[PDB]
Design a protein around this ligand. Structure first.
Ligand SMILES: Cc1cc(C)cc(NC(=O)Nc2ccc(S(N)(=O)=O)cc2)c1
Ligand SMILES: [Zn+2]
Length: 257
């Protein structure tokens, strides 16, 4: 079954998921000199005041903080998007080393980690329908660099002990995802895909220009998670990122100059 190792990793995925070699795969390298400023792009609208977090889950590939998406509580709108997208979960991808871990890269630069806030288009009724549509998801991607601590991340860090292994979950109510955002909402955008199997080509990617800074201790605690389940040999959950994929016939647009 797929993973991130030498025998089941990104180089293998195309055998079960042939869309891995498709025309709008993610992540990509963001070449900042080739991205074009689009003055018709609108500012992002991030409305997280009514967000309702529920649970945090180690799913064997990352950990997801899950939200109540049965109503318009935490939504993303504007930017390149038409319509309203509901926040369903966020998760991260990270490295074994501070110099690697992000999925997108910027002028080939790799960050220590990358946050994905996953949203689905309410015109499609449910997340399972949305992933079957070319405009079904909008994922807001935020780079993490190692430096000073991110205070709004610490409640996530402190619960990871309780979800060490695959299949463990814990209650995670009353978490405010606004504490994970950088100051600026300047962004790059392009059409892409999920970055893990089934690799569906259903995502409008919105990647913020400004990284957030997390401490070395915070990302160190990410790296103590386990890919394995309890009672299985320990496999540290590190390097759960897909490398950059060919841009093919796509243009990355910038909301800024
Ligand atoms: C509809 C459905 C049902 C189940 C049980 C799982 C999934 N998988 C899914 O949503 N995966 C997913 C993969 C990658 C991203 S990313 N890394 O591009 O933000 C988000 C969701 C999708
Ligand atoms: Zn992701």
């Amino acid at each position: 079954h797929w993973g991130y190792g030498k025998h089941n990793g990104p180089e293998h995925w195309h055998k079960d998921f042939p869309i891995a070699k498709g025309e709008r795969q993610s992540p990509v390298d963001i070449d900042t000199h080739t991205a074009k400023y689009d003055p018709s792009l609108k500012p992002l609208s991030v409305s997280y005041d009514q967000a309702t977090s529920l649970r945090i889950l180690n799913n064997g590939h990352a950990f997801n903080v899950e939200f109540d998406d049965s109503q318009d509580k935490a939504v993303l709108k504007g930017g390149p998007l038409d319509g309203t997208y509901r926040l369903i979960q966020f998760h991260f991808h990270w490295g074994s080393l501070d110099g690697q871990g992000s999925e997108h890269t910027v002028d080939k630069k790799k960050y220590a980690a990358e946050l994905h806030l996953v949203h689905w288009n309410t015109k499609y009724g449910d997340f399972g329908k949305a992933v079957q549509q070319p405009d079904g998801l909008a994922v807001l991607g935020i780079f993490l660099k190692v430096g000073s601590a991110k205070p709004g991340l610490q409640k996530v860090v402190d619960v990871l002990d309780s979800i060490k292994t695959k299949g463990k979950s814990a209650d995670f109510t009353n978490f405010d995802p606004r504490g994970l955002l950088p100051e600026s909402l300047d962004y790059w955008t392009y059409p892409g895909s999920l970055t893990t199997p089934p690799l569906l080509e259903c995502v409008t990617w919105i990647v913020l220009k400004e990284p957030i800074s997390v401490s070395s201790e915070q990302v160190l605690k990410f790296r103590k998670l386990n890919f394995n389940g309890e009672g299985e040999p320990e496999e540290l959950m590190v390097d759960n990122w897909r490398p950059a994929q060919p841009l093919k016939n796509r243009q990355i647009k910038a909301s800024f100059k």
